[model samples]
Target: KVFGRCELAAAMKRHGLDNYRGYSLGNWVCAAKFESNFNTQATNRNTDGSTDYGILQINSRWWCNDGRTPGSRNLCNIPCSALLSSDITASVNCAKKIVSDGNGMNAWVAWRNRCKGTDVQAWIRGCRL
Candidate 1:
């Protein structure tokens, strides 16, 4: 399932991501916009040959298994496809764990390149969350 920006914002707020895992909700919102545009089924192949999964685009290199990348640590203990669900709860939980591992949003290059150091407020503009 795909979500528009506002719907994604409301859902993220409902899931307690306003300041979740010590990062602002705007950071998460902005990253999602760039990473996958809230498309649950979004996936991409990285230059390193790993797959990025879901809205967070969690990578197969270190997070989840895509059956192609051998010896993935699978820290999220989930299939990569699981992240591509409309519910988003599992994806959020896994992301929180990833942040707790000290990478923060830095785990996502999209966040570093697109959301970092920018005014992310527009990500949730008029969402009323």
Candidate 2:
């Protein structure tokens, strides 16, 4: 588990995740918080018989192949386990592509339901990024 909030923010900015496509870093941070609480090993079963993987809670039905979700597009050409790594490079890239595909941060249900139109400043507050 991440012990410091500023560390996550710094890592994110260092990886160029801040302000991509006009979306604030806070939005991404907020999404990560609600999705997996920054836990890279996080996984959850969805009501649709699909599963969410990683800190972004990427859906197996569209993002990665878990061999369980039928008709999974696996557009990222990655195993869902890749997103479960402590090193977040793969997860970050996959999420960037997902966002660019059409929905911006709206691609993440957490962002839509929790971060959107909400005060997300605390996610990045005092990070100086």
Candidate 3:
């Protein structure tokens, strides 16, 4: 429930922008609230679980599954699993890869604007982290 700021901090550190993470936590929290309603267990159920999705709003199979490579272990993945098993920073990093072209926090900001609200500049400038 209180993961908003904590997760945002993790996201900042994951991108190696620790200085910026503090700067962006608020807007990131705003985005998270808008996208998943701050629900880490949230999922989209698209393609009949062919996509296991979670916080920061990511679908596992579509974004980060080994099976997509043709010859690899097919593991059903999810963002929360990563958040719980690995680390919050890892989860945010994965989310960044899925939502953005490895653009890091900026991509998160874009995601916030696109998926959550119409306030693009709010997410961008407010999250100057």
Candidate 4:
């Protein structure tokens, strides 16, 4: 599912991502824009032959089991296929695991490159959060 800016922010809020792990809602929103344009069906291949899935682009190499990522650990204990669904819960839940594991928002390079250390608040402006 593709999401509008405010719509996605509200969804993230519903999942408690607001200021989660000290990162604001805009951070997640910004990362999702560059990562997958808020599209749940998004997928990307990695250099290590693993795949990234969903809006947060959770990687198969560590967080999910794609059954084809060479040495997938499936630490999140969910099938990678679940990441592509319209509901953002699985992806958001997987993302919380990644960030809460001392990685912060750094697990996603897109966050580092696009959402970190800036006026990320702009991404959620007028969203009435």
Best by lDDT: 4
- List the candidate 4 regions with Cα displacement exceeding 4 Å: none
| Tens-digit lDDT track of model 4 for 7-99 | 999999999999888888999999999999989999999888999999889999999998898867999999999999989999989888999
> For candidate 2, lDDT tens digit of each residue in 10-106?
7777778888778778888888989998888899998888899988899999999999998779989999999898888888889888989977888
* Minimal lDDT window, size 10, model 2: 1-10
Off by over 4 Å in 3: 1-27, 66-80, 84-87, 99-129
* Stretch of 10 with least lDDT, candidate 4: 64-73
Decreasing TM-score order of the candidates: 4, 1, 2, 3
For each candidate in the order shown, give its overall lDDT on alpha carbons: 0.87, 0.85, 0.47, 0.92
Clashing pairs in 3: none
Q: What's the alpha carbon RMSD for model 3?
A: 6.4
After superposing candidate 2 on the true structure, give the runs of residues whose Cα lies further than 4 Å from its correct spot: 1-3
* Estimated TM-score for each candidate: 0.93, 0.93, 0.47, 0.97
> What local lDDT does model 2 show for residue 106?
86
lDDT of model number 3: 0.47
